[PDB]
Write a protein that binds this ligand. Structure first.
Ligand SMILES: O[C@@H]1[C@H](O)[C@H](O)CO[C@H]1O
Length: 271
């Protein structure tokens, strides 16, 4: 069996666990050996992961960048080693990439903003918990959210990165809460930060604040169902992973593939 490598940004996020399971199930299906490497959100670790794979007989590299701008050196090393690179979920700003597979994060952010305006009303006072700064996913969701801010005249009280992490999202929201107790709604750029934000609101006794997450992970869907999370934009991580391995197969078989493959989003609300 030919080996396909999957370098994922982190395995400490349910979203990336499902992405890995999607790839594993498709690799099993198509008869490939799948090696999984965790970069642990560290560009230095990511680079070393890629350097080690280029000599393991890896035929194709599926990579989820820890940083869209810094991953360029790793992609270029794969390029020198003649190993095709497919990015999943986040882009690579530099280096040659065969195909990129992800959601429309600009649309995702806009839909989140529109839903908030529908519930909390136009001109609502909002806070935004942004993802890791140098990732295409976070940059795009902020951009889509900025279109909603302008359309619905939201008053953005504060906007700060909590790095797609639940504990950080918790602490950042705790601090912004003390400084802006008049917040009406919060857009968290992933479900982990949205879950952390809910816990901060719980600790602070603020039951009145509407929170919108992003991903539709098991925990995020449970919160929406329990009525704790107002909504989440569901992604299809398992299908981003499957589409990556499927696309890896086509490349290895000499079939040309599209440069971009979108994966649908869906607004998830209770009922
Ligand atoms: O799309 C993914 C998911 O939202 C994850 O939760 C954080 O990283 C983003 O790039």
């Amino acid at each position: 069996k030919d080996t396909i490598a999957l370098v994922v940004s982190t395995l400490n996020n349910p979203f990336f666990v499902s992405l890995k399971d999607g790839a594993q199930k498709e690799a099993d299906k198509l008869g490939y050996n799948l090696v999984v490497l965790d970069s642990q959100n560290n560009p230095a670790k990511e680079l070393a992961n890629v350097q080690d794979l280029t000599v393991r007989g890896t035929k194709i590299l599926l990579i989820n960048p820890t940083d869209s701008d810094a991953v360029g050196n790793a992609v270029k090393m794969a390029n020198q080693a003649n190993i095709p690179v497919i990015t999943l979920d986040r882009q690579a700003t530099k280096g040659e990439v065969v195909s990129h597979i992800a959601s429309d994060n600009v649309l995702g952010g806009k839909i989140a903003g529109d839903y908030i305006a529908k519930k909390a009303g136009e001109g609502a006072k909002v806070i935004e918990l942004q993802g890791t700064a140098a990732t295409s996913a976070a940059r795009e969701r902020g951009e889509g959210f900025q279109q909603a801010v302008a359309a619905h005249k939201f008053n953005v009280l504060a906007s700060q990165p909590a790095d797609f992490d639940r504990i950080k999202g918790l602490n950042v929201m705790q601090n912004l809460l003390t400084a802006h107790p008049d917040v009406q709604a919060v857009f968290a750029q992933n479900d982990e930060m949205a879950l952390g934000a809910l816990r901060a609101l719980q600790t602070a006794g603020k039951s009145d604040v509407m929170v919108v997450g992003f991903d539709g992970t098991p925990d995020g869907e449970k919160a929406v169902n329990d009525g704790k999370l107002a909504a989440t934009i569901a992604q299809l991580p398992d299908q981003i992973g499957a589409k990556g391995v499927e696309t890896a197969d086509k490349v290895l078989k000499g079939e040309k593939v599209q440069a971009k493959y979108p994966v649908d989003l869906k607004l998830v609300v209770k009922q």
